[PDB]
Amino acid sequence: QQPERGKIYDRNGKVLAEDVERYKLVAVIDKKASANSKKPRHVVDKKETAKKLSTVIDMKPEEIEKRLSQKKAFQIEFGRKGTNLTYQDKLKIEKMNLPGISLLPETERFYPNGNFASHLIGRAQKNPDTGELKGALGVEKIFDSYLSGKRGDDVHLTIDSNIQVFVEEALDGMVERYQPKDLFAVVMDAKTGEILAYSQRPTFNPETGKDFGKKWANDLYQNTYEPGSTFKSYGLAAAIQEGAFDPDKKYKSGHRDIMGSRISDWNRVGWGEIPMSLGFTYSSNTLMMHLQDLVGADKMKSWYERFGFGKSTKGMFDGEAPGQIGWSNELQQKTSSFGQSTTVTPVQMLQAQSAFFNDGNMLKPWFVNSVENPVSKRQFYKGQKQIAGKPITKDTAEKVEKQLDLVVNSKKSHAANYRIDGYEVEGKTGTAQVAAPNGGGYVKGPNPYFVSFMGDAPKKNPKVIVYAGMSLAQKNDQEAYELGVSKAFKPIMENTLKYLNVGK
């Protein structure tokens, strides 16, 4: 009686969610059903029927037999263990020829890949009274009025399942190695803004419902972060445009005093009077505070605003977080220069980083390729490249790219763990303290950091941007601080470029 719910597809037309026919177990336990019948049509042996069904459904025999022993009942079912079973489970039970036993056909929502882009695809939930499906999160929810039907509409994503396997596998390794409390990776076409892969940890499996509800927030669109030093690039770009940044000009490294607080470069001691380019390759906070001073505090807030921060990107995900620019005072101002106080979404970081590879134009990231009905062929929606703004010139963008190149490839680089052999890698590293959730200050511990990397390859003329982030490793927190997210960036990026036939 329910219309088939529309399918969710990846960019190459692979099925990511679809309606299927599963089956539900029913046991007639009343003798009235088998009155005018030679063979019995009700359970005559509750003990043996309980033992045989335990060989297909995951229920102990005592529990089956207990459910079979209910008085004043015509027929009984078996809860969650008795539904959503396959055509093969059906035939295996049927060959047993247990009296009073049958399988009823029921529609379920099938995610063929299981735990796979879970927080993006989402999950639909079934009302057993009617069989109506309703999306509870993600695409299944956002596009529920379209997917629900007579046949509902299909939604096609820009996700490439091949690149998504790379991301899923790389996140799995990060969990085993670092056991972080939060972890995401996203791959974006550097020239169109399409999201080619996205995943996060922890997450759920839409097929089974395992861990669904444990974390509602999609990291790309709904979680917010103090990004850390990946943010320095936008103050870098601004200082370049305003004449403040000179690659070879020297500046005073070490520390600065901001409202009775001592903020210093990551090594406490600094490096003396060193060039700005070397200051950026080193992720120098003193550089960024010096740059802020020279640009002016009023101008720099507008700089972060033109790069999209503090505002939603107007994507297609529900409840997109706006972030906020931390500018209420000079301490917040100066710490915003290196990515604290200010909070961003990852989708905002992608939009703003895209400026450096598109002559200064930010690309609005997008993951919905099509909404269309396959019966009627009506197209409701078509995603497309769209410029979100042009905060910098082509010249400013190219000079930023020169520094990002240096970050990874300078002979004095501290990010050489992000090099991939055979490929020219570039990007920016981040290490950030994390705000404790229940107010106060920052999370405490030996390495209570949100580590990240905003990378792209091949350098200067990238095909993809790969942004990965890991918050609060609970294992190998020393290594987590040392290597950041290189242990995910490298496999994702290497496998993606090779999959995209980028020359090795």
Place this chain on the structure above:
Amino acid sequence: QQPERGKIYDRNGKVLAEDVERYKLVAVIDKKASANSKKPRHVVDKKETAKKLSTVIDMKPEEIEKRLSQKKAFQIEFGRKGTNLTYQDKLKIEKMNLPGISLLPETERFYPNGNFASHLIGRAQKNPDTGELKGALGVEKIFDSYLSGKRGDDVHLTIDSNIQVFVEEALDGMVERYQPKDLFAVVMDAKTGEILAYSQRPTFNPETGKDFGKKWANDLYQNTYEPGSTFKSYGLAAAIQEGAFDPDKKYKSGHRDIMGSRISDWNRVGWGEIPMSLGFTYSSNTLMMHLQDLVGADKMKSWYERFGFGKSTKGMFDGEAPGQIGWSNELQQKTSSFGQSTTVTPVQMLQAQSAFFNDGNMLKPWFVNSVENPVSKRQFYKGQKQIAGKPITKDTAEKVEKQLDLVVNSKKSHAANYRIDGYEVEGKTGTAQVAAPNGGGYVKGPNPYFVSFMGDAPKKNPKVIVYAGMSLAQKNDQEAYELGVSKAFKPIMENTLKYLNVGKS
């Protein structure tokens, strides 16, 4: 951090949901913590620590010691058994003074009544990275933008927790007696449309999250039913208004032949030539099919439309289902006359029934009293009695009520099981076949029914309407056919009437 989320309140100002401070246990297990410290700041005896913590949190000691045995880790936590701990769990653990052990403050969403109006109130879910709460269902979801904060705004419901207790207890009894696949009960102020209580089974516990997600649909606003014979009252009202219904006029009871289907009164044989009034007391299908003929099939489809059916009531619940009036052919039309084929929501049923007690005016049912901020005192929204339509005259409404009275109290009544001692009750009984989910036709079985009752008391001048519905009893399915929902209507109605100080006899 996160602004305090607004509270959800009942109509008397009792808290139904609110933010609280709970605690999360943390165990530092690394020796670096106790370097420049006289006393240790890490667990020095993991075995004894595992045995002491086992006396407060619900996890085995071997699992504590195992979790404490994680390598390359500074501190470890303990999953679900290790969070949402009370101030007393806090004081109990701290009195132990176990080295390396602390309790971290975490905000939780607290539902003081546990499983209580669950499918209406909903549940908010926590993002553990930030502590941000977001509603996943019901009021928490619908009003999430107001509740989320400064301080978020409070939402005040029309629910009365005193009356909600009666409904919760009465549904619990129906589950034990009948194990039905679906079951709902709702109490509405008969003169204002206010929802005084609402619940369903199965449902979830918002405090614990138990069974949340197993059924997304709120029965009041989002589930749909073939209502059965409760629907006869609206065809009855039409026939009264169109002059077709005469209480003492005789009609031929028994069966009618409709497009190769034989539909008959519930006893198969009917009762011969009996008065129309008595036909309604008996829940005569032939009466209602005869009624449609005298009004006309075109006129009757418009009749159910003016009663609000097929259309959303446009309440404040998300995704309210509209139902549909089953009229594609004469078989669907005739079966619509006694409440099959056509599908409705309970809230449409309430709205249409209220007409009979408000001189013909339908009242739009409502459950949101107020959205307002307690710091600023800004009121964003205020609920109120609102006429949804006036499909019948005052006389038609009064004539309908006389038949509803008779249904329960006629000396020839088949609904005497809904009588309550000391109170005068009226209403209409319902028994309906249920559409099988996997297409085809109806669910099969000995008594595969959705049984219901749409009642009100005191009769003629009711205080509340009580609508309860039970689909597909899996236990005592024979009794479920015999008694319908009398075993919930009576306790709910009786207890509510007493709480509202209606004089008992």
